[PDB]
Amino acid sequence: RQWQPDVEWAEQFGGAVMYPTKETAHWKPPPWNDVDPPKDTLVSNLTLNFRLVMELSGEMV
Amino acid sequence: LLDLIWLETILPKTTSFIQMKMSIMVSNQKGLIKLYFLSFLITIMISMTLFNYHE
Amino acid sequence: MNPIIYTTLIMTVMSGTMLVMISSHWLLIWIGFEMNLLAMIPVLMKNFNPRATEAATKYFLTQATASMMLMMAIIINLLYSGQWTITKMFNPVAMTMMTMALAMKLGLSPFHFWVPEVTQGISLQAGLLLLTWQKLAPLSVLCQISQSINPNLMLTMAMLSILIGGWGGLNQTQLRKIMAYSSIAHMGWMTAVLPYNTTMTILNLLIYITMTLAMFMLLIHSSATTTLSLSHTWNKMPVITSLMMVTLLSMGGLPPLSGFMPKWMIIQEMTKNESIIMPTLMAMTALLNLYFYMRLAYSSSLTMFPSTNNMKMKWQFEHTKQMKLLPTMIVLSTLVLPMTPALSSLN
Amino acid sequence: MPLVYMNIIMAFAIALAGLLMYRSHLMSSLLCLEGMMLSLFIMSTLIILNTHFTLANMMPIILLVFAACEAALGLSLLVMVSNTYGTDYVQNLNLLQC
Amino acid sequence: LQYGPLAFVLGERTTRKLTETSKVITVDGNICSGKGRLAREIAEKLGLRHFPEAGIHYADSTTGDGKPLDVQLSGNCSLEKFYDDPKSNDGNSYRLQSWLYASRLLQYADALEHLLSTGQGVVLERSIYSDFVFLEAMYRQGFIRKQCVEHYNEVKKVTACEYLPPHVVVYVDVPVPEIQSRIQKKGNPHEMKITAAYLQDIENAYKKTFLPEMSEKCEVLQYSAREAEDAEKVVEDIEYLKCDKGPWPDQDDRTFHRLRMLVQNKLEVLNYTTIPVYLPEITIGAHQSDRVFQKFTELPGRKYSPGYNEDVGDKWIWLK
Amino acid sequence: MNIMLTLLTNVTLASLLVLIAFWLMKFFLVAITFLLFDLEIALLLPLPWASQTNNLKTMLTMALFLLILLAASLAYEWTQKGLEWAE
Amino acid sequence: MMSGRPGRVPLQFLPNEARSLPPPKLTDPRLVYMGFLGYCSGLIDNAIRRRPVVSAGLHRQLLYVTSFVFFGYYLLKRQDYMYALRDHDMFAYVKSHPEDFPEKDKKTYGEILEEFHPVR
Amino acid sequence: KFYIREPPHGSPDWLKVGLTLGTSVFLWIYLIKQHKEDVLEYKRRNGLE
Amino acid sequence: KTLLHKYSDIPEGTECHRKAYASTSIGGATGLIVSAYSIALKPPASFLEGVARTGRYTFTSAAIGAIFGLTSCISAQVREKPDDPLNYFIGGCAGGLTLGARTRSYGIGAAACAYMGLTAALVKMGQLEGWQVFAEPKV
Amino acid sequence: MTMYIAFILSTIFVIGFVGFSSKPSPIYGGLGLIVSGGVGCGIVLNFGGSFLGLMVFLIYLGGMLVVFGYTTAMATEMYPEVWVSNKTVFGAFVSGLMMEFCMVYYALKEEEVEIIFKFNGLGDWVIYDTGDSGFFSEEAMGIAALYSYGTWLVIVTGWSLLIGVVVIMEITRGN
Numbered sequence A: 001r002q003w004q005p006d007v008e009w010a011e012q013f014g015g016a017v018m019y020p021t022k023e024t025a026h027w028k029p030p031p032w033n034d035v036d037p038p039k040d041t042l043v044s045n046l047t048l049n050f051r052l053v054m055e056l057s058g059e060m061v
Numbered sequence B: 001l002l003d004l005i006w007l008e009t010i011l012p013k014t015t016s017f018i019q020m021k022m023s024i025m026v027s028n029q030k031g032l033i034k035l036y037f038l039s040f041l042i043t044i045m046i047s048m049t050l051f052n053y054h055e
Numbered sequence C: 001m002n003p004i005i006y007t008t009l010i011m012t013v014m015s016g017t018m019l020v021m022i023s024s025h026w027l028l029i030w031i032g033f034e035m036n037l038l039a040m041i042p043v044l045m046k047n048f049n050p051r052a053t054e055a056a057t058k059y060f061l062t063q064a065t066a067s068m069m070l071m072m073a074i075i076i077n078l079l080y081s082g083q084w085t086i087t088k089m090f091n092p093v094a095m096t097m098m099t100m101a102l103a104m105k106l107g108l109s110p111f112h113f114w115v116p117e118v119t120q121g122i123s124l125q126a127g128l129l130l131l132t133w134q135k136l137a138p139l140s141v142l143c144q145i146s147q148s149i150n151p152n153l154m155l156t157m158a159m160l161s162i163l164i165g166g167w168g169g170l171n172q173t174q175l176r177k178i179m180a181y182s183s184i185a186h187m188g189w190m191t192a193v194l195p196y197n198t199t200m201t202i203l204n205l206l207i208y209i210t211m212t213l214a215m216f217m218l219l220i221h222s223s224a225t226t227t228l229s230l231s232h233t234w235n236k237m238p239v240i241t242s243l244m245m246v247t248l249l250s251m252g253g254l255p256p257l258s259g260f261m262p263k264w265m266i267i268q269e270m271t272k273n274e275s276i277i278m279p280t281l282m283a284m285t286a287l288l289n290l291y292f293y294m295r296l297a298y299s300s301s302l303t304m305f306p307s308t309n310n311m312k313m314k315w316q317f318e319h320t321k322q323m324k325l326l327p328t329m330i331v332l333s334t335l336v337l338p339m340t341p342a343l344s345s346l347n
Numbered sequence D: 001m002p003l004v005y006m007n008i009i010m011a012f013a014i015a016l017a018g019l020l021m022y023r024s025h026l027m028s029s030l031l032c033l034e035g036m037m038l039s040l041f042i043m044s045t046l047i048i049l050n051t052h053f054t055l056a057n058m059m060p061i062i063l064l065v066f067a068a069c070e071a072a073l074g075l076s077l078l079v080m081v082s083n084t085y086g087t088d089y090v091q092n093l094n095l096l097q098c
Numbered sequence E: 001l002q003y004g005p006l007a008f009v010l011g012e013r014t015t016r017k018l019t020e021t022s023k024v025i026t027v028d029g030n031i032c033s034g035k036g037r038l039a040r041e042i043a044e045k046l047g048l049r050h051f052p053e054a055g056i057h058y059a060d061s062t063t064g065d066g067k068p069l070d071v072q073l074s075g076n077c078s079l080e081k082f083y084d085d086p087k088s089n090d091g092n093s094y095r096l097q098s099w100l101y102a103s104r105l106l107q108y109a110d111a112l113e114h115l116l117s118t119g120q121g122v123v124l125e126r127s128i129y130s131d132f133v134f135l136e137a138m139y140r141q142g143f144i145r146k147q148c149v150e151h152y153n154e155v156k157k158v159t160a161c162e163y164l165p166p167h168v169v170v171y172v173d174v175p176v177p178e179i180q181s182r183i184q185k186k187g188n189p190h191e192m193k194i195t196a197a198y199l200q201d202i203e204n205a206y207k208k209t210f211l212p213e214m215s216e217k218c219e220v221l222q223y224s225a226r227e228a229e230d231a232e233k234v235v236e237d238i239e240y241l242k243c244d245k246g247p248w249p250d251q252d253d254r255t256f257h258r259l260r261m262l263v264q265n266k267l268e269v270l271n272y273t274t275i276p277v278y279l280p281e282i283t284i285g286a287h288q289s290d291r292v293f294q295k296f297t298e299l300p301g302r303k304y305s306p307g308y309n310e311d312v313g314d315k316w317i318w319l320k
Numbered sequence F: 001m002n003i004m005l006t007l008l009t010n011v012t013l014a015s016l017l018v019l020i021a022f023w024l025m026k027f028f029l030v031a032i033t034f035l036l037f038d039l040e041i042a043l044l045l046p047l048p049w050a051s052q053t054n055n056l057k058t059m060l061t062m063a064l065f066l067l068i069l070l071a072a073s074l075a076y077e078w079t080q081k082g083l084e085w086a087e
Numbered sequence G: 001m002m003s004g005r006p007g008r009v010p011l012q013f014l015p016n017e018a019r020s021l022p023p024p025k026l027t028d029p030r031l032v033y034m035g036f037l038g039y040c041s042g043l044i045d046n047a048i049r050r051r052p053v054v055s056a057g058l059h060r061q062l063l064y065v066t067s068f069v070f071f072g073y074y075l076l077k078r079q080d081y082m083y084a085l086r087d088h089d090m091f092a093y094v095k096s097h098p099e100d101f102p103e104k105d106k107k108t109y110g111e112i113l114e115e116f117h118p119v120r
Numbered sequence H: 001k002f003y004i005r006e007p008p009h010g011s012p013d014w015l016k017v018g019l020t021l022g023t024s025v026f027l028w029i030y031l032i033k034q035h036k037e038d039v040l041e042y043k044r045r046n047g048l049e
Numbered sequence I: 001k002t003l004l005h006k007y008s009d010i011p012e013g014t015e016c017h018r019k020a021y022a023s024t025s026i027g028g029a030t031g032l033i034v035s036a037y038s039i040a041l042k043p044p045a046s047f048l049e050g051v052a053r054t055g056r057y058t059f060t061s062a063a064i065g066a067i068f069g070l071t072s073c074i075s076a077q078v079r080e081k082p083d084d085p086l087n088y089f090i091g092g093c094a095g096g097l098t099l100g101a102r103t104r105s106y107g108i109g110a111a112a113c114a115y116m117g118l119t120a121a122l123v124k125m126g127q128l129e130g131w132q133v134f135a136e137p138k139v
Numbered sequence J: 001m002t003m004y005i006a007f008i009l010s011t012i013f014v015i016g017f018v019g020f021s022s023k024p025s026p027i028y029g030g031l032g033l034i035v036s037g038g039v040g041c042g043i044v045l046n047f048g049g050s051f052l053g054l055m056v057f058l059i060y061l062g063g064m065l066v067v068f069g070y071t072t073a074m075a076t077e078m079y080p081e082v083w084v085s086n087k088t089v090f091g092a093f094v095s096g097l098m099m100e101f102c103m104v105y106y107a108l109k110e111e112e113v114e115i116i117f118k119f120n121g122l123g124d125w126v127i128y129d130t131g132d133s134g135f136f137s138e139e140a141m142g143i144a145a146l147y148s149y150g151t152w153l154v155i156v157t158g159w160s161l162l163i164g165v166v167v168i169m170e171i172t173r174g175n
């Protein structure tokens, strides 16, 4: 049979940057969902010392 | 020596190597708005003033 | 988002772009530009992922800056002319000031930095609108004021576009990014002939739209975003990647595949204007575009790539998307070359 | 060309430089983004008032009005950045590196 | 047409169809812990569309005749093979799980489509959220490797994110000596070859991670197999609750258009199941893939798009 | 002349007093809605002079157009949660 | 180039005086190519949808051919019109500026020298 | 029948197809009509026939 | 285009000091622009590193221009043929050899002629023949 | 200076313009441009644009920046910027005084300032005309013509604002 690409051939066309270099050594492939995983939650659950300790979600307790 | 060592490294590989290096940093920016818009600032300044396109 | 507002948000984008080409007043020219920008952002933000928000910020910052810069191209024009009519610019400083404004909205010279990044962040459907429809409006203004445009200034923008556009695609693995870089290279081609004969710019625009439409829905049908994801598509749908190869070569510009028609006409027009170095370097570096073009063709259908076991699942089910106007777009974008003398219709 | 026109013209030029020369906080650019149109709005009024172009008094209002939708569009995108990273700092505005 | 934009424009909602009997039931348990029968009992007591436990040929029993296909033509893996040989070289172990996860995932999409088009609840066995307990347990004794896990959970996050968690989970608690003694009573020669080590790993993975990780998404209705036998008990308190946890008791017609966009597109639900991660146990080279696909082509029905097969008997091809 | 002269003395009278008296997402959402609910106010701010035009018919149908468009924009916010301060 | 000529009412696909030209015949080789492209669209449509391309519905292909034939014929008239216009105003101009295009006198090759270059 | 469920195209959609021929027959009859007087008008506009 | 006119106005092979000063001015001006872009798109370390990179880029560009102007003018009047295209070509390695030494690797130096040498030769053909690169729209 | 009062008005306009364009804290940047916004009104007011001067107060000064300062309130950097925090902002500020005081002095000279454009920086009072406005106010009549002559201008402005409100809610709901 004629030659067909193996896994190593695919890895050639498989990096984040097609021609790797030191400047792009640590560049990572994009997530398949195109959705970067959520970071630490930026919720302002500020507990107000009403002494009554009580948190809020900006408006709501 | 000539055919498949030099004649392939004079035209083919050198142009491939030249195109390789240029494509290295053209495709590799940093994704920072500060660096981008700053490169806009020179581009606008150099366009009007020193290429003399206003004249 | 909700389709009814999604319909009218996109629908206004046509309306804003429509207004750019159907208003003789400079103020209304900006009016359609920023109505267009106002409704473009939510479509970018349709997916609502951190990358989608990332893409929208870059696009808005770039587009907003150009349009405010566009006003003062108008303002000095008014300052030295008192005319709001869309004709020959009367002030050299405003004229260049305008050209940089529109070029950034089009992204050819290093204004192009947002074009790859913004394209990758947004979804494939949103990428279609960004690189196809939200490009007529800046070209509409340039066509009207082409006679006045500074030849050195415009051509310099053109070569830097195709040169970078050629080089940028050689190293991107994402299908969206190489799509964007080739879009930049084509954009240099149209604006290059723009000072000489606007009919060829429109012909290039009309032709270039065809593949960019055709390629995008093909990718959407393939549901592929990276080269490896495109590689698997041969197994489930060997036909679809076969047509993608044909239109991919047509984008390269190899006769008789239509797509060489714009490049052919540009070279002939520039040659008639005694400019002969401009086309040669322009055509020579078009090979740079062809490399990562063929490179995609190598991994698409020309050599079958390894597949995965789960792909056996996909064979059982048929596609549900409707991909309207795809069959006409593919055919009209690969074999229309013998109908080249239809150029007089655009005149 | 009168001095007052020169003063506004340079006012934008620093504003254009101010927006293009960027800083860590994305707020400041948004101030300068619509600041640059304020000079556009201010000078626009100057020519029309000077030239007695009665009908062209149209422009100064509507120019600002759509500049407002952009600013309204501006910070609305900004809060999403703040709701994903914590600060609008633009050095972290690089998720699209790849 | 389906929920495609025109149907949504003409006023067709989905909250209009939803009633109190609209929940996702995950009646899980242990290996052959009797949860399969409890699935039918719960389904028939409250009138929920029951879904049989997903297997290797589940997708085969979705399209065409809804009949199992050749293992080579569909799946290439064999649970019996994994049952007989624990650690083989053909890679049946991991490939069985990943194909299983995809089959369960397709089952989830079919379940949601029925619910989102009828408003009637659905009960499923071994939901796609559970699936990871088996694979990690298979890793504990060495059925798969470290590099195997990376592909599976990568598919898990890119796929299971958009699907909403279930409302009701029934963990039929059956203890290890009973299962390790009951598997002799089944008698199917493949499932005698079950190690207590592989069993011991699956239950501890269940209680410690399956219930807690999605407890905040829906309440945990723990039920011993003794409680599982008395179907009358479990049917009271499934109704005695609301399931305020998770994002399901917040969604509206805005998200439901998106949800029925994806589930209707069967290719879209599993488009991400084929991630180009080149793991040796699932990567199939071109030569085998081409021949197998060519074998798939000239099979009846599969030659053309559905309804366009003259071989089956679809007349009016020259007009349709 | 008088306008800055006024402006001058009020500020200084306030400046002298402060020195002498010392040396001796929904919250965001309502913000932009107001901004987008404030611009067309400037559109309809010129109107007492607009009513002096010769063509009352166009003026009447047009100022009515903005107000009903203002009503529609308000109505869209009202129905699609909008004005509701997201709890 | 055209765009801006006298009597050029815009958004018109076929001005009235364009009808004074010979309309293309239905067997025009350019026109039959339009039909060929339409037919090729029909094959692609069935191939895209995984249908028996050769005879997968004679209704879809028939519309494809007719629509392309239609749009071609109207495009051909505008094609024929502009080229006729392009040559027409030239002849008016060439008689409007006689001094710019003076007829050079004709001298047979019995007079003009061509300094024949031998080949060796 | 092989398929468990009737597919969306697995039936002759008489109303849709009948429209398709209706589009074409009206299209051709317009085309052969338009060529007729356009030729006839060109005959008499220049004085040929 | 003061710099371009300044270099062109000096007759070929005459006032080599004027030609060299004119040539290095163009080289230095171009070196400034590329360095500014390099700093822009690639932010360096503390400002000393930024000026260090700026110094390198300007010095290399100025060096290439200065000696090229010297070799071109020298080649013109020493051989007493001002219209010779080869006059600039030997400047190509001259400029090229300079680059090959600035990076301390003659592999780039070897390729440096064949392209810069041809282009430097090519520019001379443009001046003699009358080639226009950015031609004004004529038709 | 009485003769060049608008010139003082114009000069104050740019110094505040430079201050906030120097990227200070957004609250401080707000101060830098609002004083620039106020002083620019005096320039328009001095020319006769009574409504246009007073109107920029209400929608830009008392408008734009109130919600803008609202946004910086929720940004609430734990390290709020003061002009002394970084030397870059001071460098821009002393710069912004530098070239401004430079070419105004050169303007005070022979008056052939030719940066970019050609400017004759004479007293700004010269540019006005000698034509009375009768009874009708020129600025007031022009804007009032929005509902009589601004047929297309009002429609697109109204349409875009309606698009403006829907897009704002569409991109802030976060799906």
Ligand SMILES: CCCCCCCCCCCCCCCCCC(=O)OC[C@H](COP(=O)(O)OCCN)OC(=O)CCCCCCCCCCCCCCCCC
Binding pocket: C237, C238, C239, C240, C242, C245, C246, C256, C257, C301, C302, E303, G043, G047, G051, G052, G053, G054
């Ligand atoms: C300009 C230069 C050339 C440019 C174009 C080159 C294109 C090919 C280049 C190489 C492409 C990549 C390598 C090969 C990829 C193959 C892709 C593929 O899917 O192959 C397998 C597939 C199997 O066939 P299948 O899809 O089942 O369809 C059968 C017919 N229904 O095969 C197919 O899907 C192919 C189906 C083809 C069907 C053809 C039908 C022709 C009908 C002709 C009718 C003529 C009537 C004449 C009448 C005359 C009188 C009027």
Ligand SMILES: CCCCCCCCCCCCCCCCCC(=O)OC[C@H](COP(=O)(O)OCCN)OC(=O)CCCCCCCCCCCCCCCCC
Binding pocket: I004, I007, I023, I024, I026, I027, I030, I031, I034, I035, I056, I057, I060, I061, I064, I065, I068, I069, I103, I123
């Ligand atoms: C007849 C009139 C003129 C007479 C004088 C001769 C012409 C002018 C002088 C020569 C100009 C061309 C030679 C190159 C000059 C710039 C050199 C330069 O930028 O060097 C830095 C760098 C190369 O080194 P790098 O790859 O960065 O590796 C080290 C990394 N640490 O650079 C790079 O990495 C990027 C690649 C080089 C920069 C881009 C190309 C610059 C030159 C463009 C053409 C300029 C033409 C000027 C003359 C005609 C127009 C006036």
Ligand SMILES: Nc1nc2c(ncn2[C@@H]2O[C@H](COP(=O)(O)OP(=O)(O)OP(=O)(O)O)[C@@H](O)[C@H]2O)c(=O)[nH]1
Binding pocket: E029, E030, E031, E032, E033, E034, E035, E036, E037, E053, E079, E096, E097, E100, E125, E126, E130, E131, E132, E134, E135
């Ligand atoms: N690898 C793997 N196998 C699974 C998974 N879910 C179910 N299975 C297999 O499915 C088969 C049938 O499940 P059993 O519990 O043994 O039998 P059953 O007939 O379903 O009985 P009940 O569990 O009582 O309904 C067994 O071989 C399981 O190991 C999974 O997520 N991964």
